Amino acid sequence: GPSVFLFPPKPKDTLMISRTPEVTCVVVDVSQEDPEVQFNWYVDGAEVHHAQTKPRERQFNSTYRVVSVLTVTHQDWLNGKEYTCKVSNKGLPAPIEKTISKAKGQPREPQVYILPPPQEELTKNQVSLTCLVTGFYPSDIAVEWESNGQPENTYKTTPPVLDSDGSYFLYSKLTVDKSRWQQGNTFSCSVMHEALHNHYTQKSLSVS
């Protein structure tokens, strides 16, 4: 019957304070005469009550699904206190509790590298760019690219890829133009990953 799913926030959300990251709790398989639950949290054994819970969001397939937030002061996560959701509903015998904290590991400083494009693209009238990122733990990460001060969106970035050194890697791509590049300017690769001098790093190089 009732199953329970909770989720840690996005890396990008943990790596900047401007958005408090949210450890979230979620429940489906909840019928009607099956009283709503309370989202008892327990941070390492601390009955904190910052929950920005919402009501039961019903479903087409007839499931009173519910949610509830618990934001956290970012630091508690960079060392990952042990968090716990808990269910307070008449229904399944007794509650459901699922601990969650960033997977252990002495993290690693990533290796960011910008790679200018090649000759079979140079010639093409619109050319793309690569910021390889290797050897970092954990895969919890985010990346952006920005064109000389003002940022960008015209870029994509592949979800990570397991790599035999216990550490991950990944790439991205910027579809810049002839107009911008050879006509004098560089571009910047922004890399948010905890274990680094201010986590964020930026790389950049131009015509050379």
Ligand X SMILES: *[C@@H]1O[C@H](CO[C@@H]2O[C@@H](C)[C@@H](O)[C@@H](O)[C@@H]2O)[C@@H](O[C@@H]2O[C@H](CO)[C@@H](O[C@@H]3O[C@H](CO[C@H]4O[C@H](CO)[C@@H](O)[C@H](O)[C@@H]4O[C@@H]4O[C@H](CO)[C@@H](O)[C@H](O)[C@H]4NC(C)=O)[C@@H](O)[C@H](O[C@H]4O[C@H](CO)[C@@H](O)[C@H](O)[C@@H]4O[C@@H]4O[C@H](CO)[C@@H](O)[C@H](O)[C@H]4NC(C)=O)[C@@H]3O)[C@H](O)[C@H]2NC(C)=O)[C@H](O)[C@H]1NC(C)=O
- Residue 93: half-sphere exposure toward Cβ, Cα within 13 Å: 0
DSSP-derived letter for residue 14 is H
| Bond before 35 cis per omega within 30 degrees | no
State both tokens at 104: 């252990």
Burial of 17 (0-12, 13-18, 19+ CB in 10 A): exposed
Selected from 16, 26, 92, 132, the binder of ligand X by CB under 6 A is 26
Selected from 38, 63, 71, 130, the binder of its own copies by CB under 8 A is 130
Which of the choices ligand X, its own copies, none does residue 189 contact, using the CB cut-off of 5 to 8 A by kind? Answer: none
Residue at shortest CB range from ligand X: 60
Nearest CB to its own copies, comparing residues 21 and 110:
110
Q: How far apart are CA 18 and CA 13, in angstroms?
A: 8
What is the CA 101 to chain-centroid distance, rounded? 14
Nearest CB to its own copies, comparing residues 91 and 117:
117
99 binds ligand X (CB under 6 A): no
DSSP-derived letter for residue 56 is -
Which of the choices its own copies, ligand X, none does residue 5 contact, using the CB cut-off of 5 to 8 A by kind? Answer: ligand X
Nearest CB to ligand X, comparing residues 65 and 74:
65
63 binds its own copies (CB under 8 A): no
Number of residues this chain uses to bind ligand X (CB under 6 A): 12
CA dihedral for 180, 149, 135, 80, sign (positive or negative): negative
Which of the choices ligand X, its own copies, none does residue 7 contact, using the CB cut-off of 5 to 8 A by kind? Answer: ligand X
Task: Tell me which residues touch ligand X (CB under 6 A).
Answer: 3, 5, 7, 24, 26, 28-29, 59-61, 63, 65
